[PDB]
């Protein structure tokens, strides 16, 4: 059982005593601070609201547990038992908080307000920043979704250039990251963020998350195909790699199948085994059931180029309408080792220079997609901008002398469209002057209830590339 | 609920059809593959065993759920329903798997077997690698614990050099990482791994995990102190930073308290506010209740040194027996911005060069401690090394031509002490020759039961530094 009284940074337990006396409102906001990655995909808050923040989240038992834990943790009694009891008694354990947010899937330039948080009861001034820790973890799905979308932009550009269309784009970057993330929960969140942009995943945890918290019209949001791992090749013994290959493509003769081919010698596997010994089993396959060859070691670009070079001399290559080389439809490649946004760029550029179509290849990305990310990439940050003390509203902010990049926004915030149709965040309550039309934030949480939410299909629509919008 | 049939990489659903016919045994192992970080702390497996693998993990409903999902996910019927139903009927849904592992907390050189996995029923040859995905996630607590321990070695060396002892060492790197990790579950796992080495954390999730899965003699494994955040300073208004400081140190007058001091101008705050206006509230404080000044921006080394220089001129500094400068006991500093293992090293070395004792400072680390880590750091990897097919055991391995670093081990493995007291992994069942003493791997899981468990106290003892032994 999750306990929201135990789901904050320790020192926040002590903050209720530190605010100015007679403070009745604390108002805070989240942004991806301006400091590559010029725009972010807002995704993941809905999960957090539903899983952790909504409904009766305070009980007598949870207050006692927190009391006992913090007594030992601080070696002193500093826990606000009275504040939490108030919430329990007055609101039946529902949080007196109002959260406003940009729609999920929205693509927003850095430095804009993405959501705001304030208490709805003066007694709970301390509650706003108590839940900072939980809410700031939204950085992760935001960052995965953003970085995934940036990779889609690269793939789209090169696919359009070398093929003339975007067919297959949504399956070109496949989530291989399940084993390479830090936990089961992270796997689900991160996989779901990748599926904002793509439809290929092996991280099954993402499907369940999406079904429970977002929903899609389709039965599932993402797909995979049968494929070998090194163990199903190596188990046959070093002298029987060909036997393994033959068994596997025969077992999966009418559906796509990927076979990792670098257990011993990738170049030999491609040229002699696939290219000669088992060639007859490949050229007989359907366009809907290709063999996908998977190299998995060596320099990613050099290895991809060599594999294509080998296959191109053993199989009938065509030249598409753009002048780029294309493997026959029953044969494709996937590079699933060492792929991140940088190496992805290097490989597609290298292929283009060697006149190979991006139609030939798909990418699998694990740690690079889901784990090699931090809060510093987009500078996702939660800050207090407005308080009311003794009935007087004050615009508040930090502004460190040695780092102007850490300056925060002042006052009540709102998000607007400019006359040119761009986004602008108004500070100091200036949204109230109505010179910039209506606030684009929506109330998504209020007093323990989720008041607005988005289907995964809507989120996908919101996150589309301009070139997909055409 | 969690469903183990849905907790694997999708393609593993199809592997049961791909192994050699007549395969009755698949035996696999985990190592932090060799090619910095020469030894690793083995920690975290016990969590995974208890939370995800033990007991009745297969039910009729979970099989049906998996069957339904994979039908749509693959747009095909490829799911091994028969294999999972067998486990349900024969073993009441308990996994016919045996896992042997080195004791948690053990510090083991890279490139050694840390645990092995094998099926205990011939019908479940496919199950060994089904659970690769979930077991490989042990990379994370291993890597957090290892990287945290490596920072402890740095702090230990410089503390010993500048002070002559290791007093306070276990509180010198504090977990600030709760907001900076990817999930609530990750927070708990990562925080608990840091606590293998240290006793300071603000990531409360770690305490609950340790209490539930490991256990300690003491009430809690980790501790914190009251402290301000920027919002409790800035809420007072720009012109009232001094009023904020005064209120907070007075509220917390007889316990340690940290106050973030860089909201507007850290140098002004130290020299004029702490150093003059409120100096009388600081010099009156107890040794057991210092003020801890927290800078939080600018170049970490440059800012620490400037803060110390300012404070050194406003407060009485002593020179300890090693010749290093020491702030009075009622005043300390914590640097909690931009700290990772590299910058930690830069700061303590910079301090030493400027004749400041490491006694003066503690470090807070968030993203650098719990999030800026990947499976590539220690090359944590799970590989099949032994199979039985047609009643014959075969030693198997990968050995990619273009990367010898990815070669895997052959055959049945065991971990042993060398005559010099180091570690060695014996391959090809050679441990059976009994020339190397007893296997250091113990059975920790068998047929759905956890068979050997460690307390957090035991793990801490195993992970101790030499310098404190
Ligand atoms: C209508 C079709 C022809 C369309 N076509 C689209 C591109 C895909 S793309 O090539 C691919 C290939 C293999 C897989 C299956 N998963 C692993 O192979 C896999 C997981 C994994 C985890 C960790 N480490 C390695 C891994 O490999 C998943 C997508 C193929 C199907
Ligand atoms: C007997 C005593 C004198 C011993 N002494 C040992 C060194 C500690 S070390 O200096 C410190 C200071 C402040 C805190 C409290 N936590 C934040 O200040 C804190 C969290 C956090 C999260 C994310 N971002 C920023 C954060 O700051 C925790 C340890 C102090 C006490």
Structure description:
It is classed as transferase/transferase inhibitor. Keywords: Transferase-Transferase inhibitor complex. Chain A is an alpha+beta fold. Chain A folds into 2 domains: 1-136 and 375-453, no CATH class; 137-374 and 454-470, Aldolase class I (TIM Barrel). Chain A is 35% helix and 17% strand. The first copy, chain A, is built from 17 helices and 18 strands. Chain A has helices at 45-53, 60-73, 81-91, 127-130, 132-136, 139-163, 184-194, 205-213, 230-234, 241-251, 266-277, 279-282, 300-314, 341-353, 367-370, 456-462, 466-469; strands at 23-32, 39-41, 97-101, 107-109, 113-119, 173-175, 257-260, 291-294, 318-319, 325-326, 331-335, 361-365, 380-389, 392-395, 414-417, 423-426, 442-446, 449-450. The first copy, chain A, has a 7-stranded antiparallel β-sheet. In chain A, strands 6-12-11-8-7 form a 5-stranded parallel β-sheet. Chain A has a two-stranded antiparallel sheet with strand order 2-4. In chain A, helix 6 packs across helix 7 (184-194), helix 6 packs parallel to helix 14 and helix 11 runs parallel beside helix 13. At the A-B interface, strand 1, helix 2, helix 5, helix 7 and helix 8 of A face strand 1, helix 2, helix 5, helix 7 and helix 8 of B. Bound molecules: the ligand CC(C)CN1CCC([S@](=O)c2ccc(CNC(=O)c3cc4ccncc4o3)cc2)CC1 (2 copies). One copy of the ligand CC(C)CN1CCC([S@](=O)c2ccc(CNC(=O)c3cc4ccncc4o3)cc2)CC1 binds next to strand 12 of chain A. One ligand 3TQ is lined by residues 171, 174, 176, 200, 202, 224-225, 227, 256, 258, 290, 292, 334, 336, 362, 364, 366 of chain A.
């Amino acid at each position: 059982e999750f306990n929201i009284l135990l789901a904050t940074d320790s020192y926040k337990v002590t903050h209720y005593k530190q605010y100015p006396p007679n403070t009745s409102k604390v108002y805070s906001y989240f942004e991806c601070r301006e400091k590559k990655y010029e725009e972010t995909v807002f995704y993941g808050l809905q999960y957090i609201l539903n899983k952790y923040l909504k409904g009766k989240v305070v009980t007598k038992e949870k207050i006692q547990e927190a009391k006992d834990v913090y007594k030992e943790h601080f070696q002193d009694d500093v826990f606000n038992e009275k504040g939490w009891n108030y919430i329990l008694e007055k609101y039946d354990g529902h949080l007196p908080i109002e959260i406003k947010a940009v729609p999920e899937g929205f693509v927003i330039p850095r430095g804009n307000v993405l959501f705001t948080v304030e208490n709805t009861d003066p007694e709970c001034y301390w509650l706003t920043n108590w839940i900072e820790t939980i809410l700031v973890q939204s950085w992760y799905p935001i960052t995965v979704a953003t970085n995934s979308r940036e990779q889609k932009k690269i793939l789209a550009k090169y696919l359009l250039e070398t093929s003339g269309n975007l067919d297959g784009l949504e399956y070109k970057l496949h989530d291989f990251g399940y084993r390479g993330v830090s936990s089961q929960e992270t796997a689900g969140i991160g996989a779901s963020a990748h599926l904002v942009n793509f439809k290929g995943t092996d991280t099954v945890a993402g499907l369940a998350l999406i079904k429970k918290y977002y929903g899609t019209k389709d039965p599932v949001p993402g797909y995979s195909v049968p494929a070998a791992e090194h163990s199903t090749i190596t188990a046959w013994g070093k002298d029987h790699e060909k036997d393994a290959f033959e068994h596997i493509v025969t077992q999966f003769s009418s559906v796509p199948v990927s076979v990792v081919s670098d257990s011993y010698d990738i170049y030999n596997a491609c040229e002699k085994i696939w290219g000669e010994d088992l060639r007859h089993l490949i050229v007989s396959r359907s366009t809907q059931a290709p063999l996908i060859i998977r190299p998995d070691s060596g320099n990613p670009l050099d290895t991809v180029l060599k594999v294509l070079e080998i296959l191109g001399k053993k199989f009938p290559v065509t030249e598409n309408s753009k002048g780029y080389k294309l493997l026959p439809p029953y044969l494709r490649v996937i590079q699933g080792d060492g792929v991140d946004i940088n190496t992805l760029q290097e490989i597609v550029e290298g292929m283009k220079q060697k006149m190979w179509s991006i139609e030939n290849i798909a990418f699998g990305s694990g740690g690079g997609l889901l784990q090699k990310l931090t809060r510093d990439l987009l500078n996702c940050s939660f800050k207090c901008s407005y308080v009311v003390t003794n009935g007087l509203g004050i615009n508040v902010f930090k502004d460190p002398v040695a780092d102007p990049n850490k300056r925060s926004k002042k006052g009540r915030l709102s998000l607007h469209r400019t006359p040119a149709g761009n986004f602008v965040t108004l500070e100091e309550g200036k949204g109230d002057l109505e010179e910039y039309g209506q606030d684009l934030l929506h109330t998504v949480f209020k007093n323990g209830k989720v008041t607005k939410s988005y289907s995964f299909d809507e989120i996908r629509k919101n996150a589309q590339l301009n070139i997909e919008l055409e």
